[PDB]
């Protein structure tokens, strides 16, 4: 099923859950999403899609989820290639910069600053030949590809801009695009009402890309239907 999950909030709030996933499905199945922005001179760790203050640091945050066992960081603030040089010699676990770029001349400056893979969704979409630009000149394995999908009208179509457009496109003929295009892995989330369990047994078959599965679990119960 899933290869990976990510984590965020559920991980601040409960270290050892990172600990837990990566004892039981190996550290390699263990992505932290990081979120930071800068409070009074230095990185902070904020929580609730960057709504509130954990009152941690970055430097401290990144060093903790390491030694719980983290396998990656998904690392979010074109680019703040000052916070991720500040992350790059804190950790020696790859470093996913969150995207939001659509040009090459900005996800140069991402891996230049010390990322190992870029996450790119809506522009990808507009421009799938973006894919295959990463893929070329860093690599496949530096392409991260993020889905988000869902039900309409009894097929699990695309959308873009967080999840707010219909692009129209189906789940199926892009998860197969992006592979075409060589993207190295897929990041899937459900905007459908935990794990959209179906979804993740829809694309699985659809590709040999690893697959990373954004959730909002709490618990090590939930976390194990997306493996």
């Known amino acids: 099923l899933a290869d990976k999950v990510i984590i965020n909030t559920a991980a601040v709030e409960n270290p050892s859950l990172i600990t837990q996933i990566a004892q039981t499905f190996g550290s390699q199945a263990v992505v932290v999403a990081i979120d ?7 990185f902070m760790a ?4 960057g709504k509130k203050n954990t009152g941690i640091l970055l430097r401290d945050w990144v060093v903790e989820v390491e030694k719980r066992g983290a396998g990656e960081i998904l690392l979010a603030s074109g680019y703040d290639t000052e916070m991720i040089r ?6 020696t676990l790859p470093i996913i910069a969150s995207g939001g770029a659509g040009k090459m001349e900005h996800f140069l400056e991402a891996f230049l600053a010390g990322a190992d893979k870029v996450s790119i969704n809506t522009a990808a979409v507009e ?3 973006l894919i295959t630009q990463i893929a ?12 988000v999908a869902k039900r309409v009208d009894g097929e699990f179509m695309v959308f873009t ?5 219909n692009t129209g496109i189906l789940l199926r003929d892009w998860v197969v695009e992006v592979e075409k295009r060589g993207a190295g892995e897929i990041l899937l989330t459900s905007i459908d009402r935990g794990y959209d369990t179906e979804m993740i047994r829809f694309v699985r078959p659809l590709t040999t890309l690893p697959i990373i599965a954004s959730g909002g679990a709490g618990k090590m119960e939930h976390f ?4």
Do not use: C, M
């Open 161 to 165: 801009y967080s999840g707010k457009k």
């Open 46 to 49: 904020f929580t609730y899609s």
């Open 86 to 91: 500040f992350v790059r010699p804190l950790t």
């Open 36 to 42: 930071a922005k800068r409070v009074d001179g230095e």
């Open 136 to 147: 070329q000149t860093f690599g496949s394995q530096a392409v991260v590809v993020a889905i």
């Open 127 to 129: 421009n799938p030949s």
């Open 224 to 227: 194990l239907e997306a493996f």
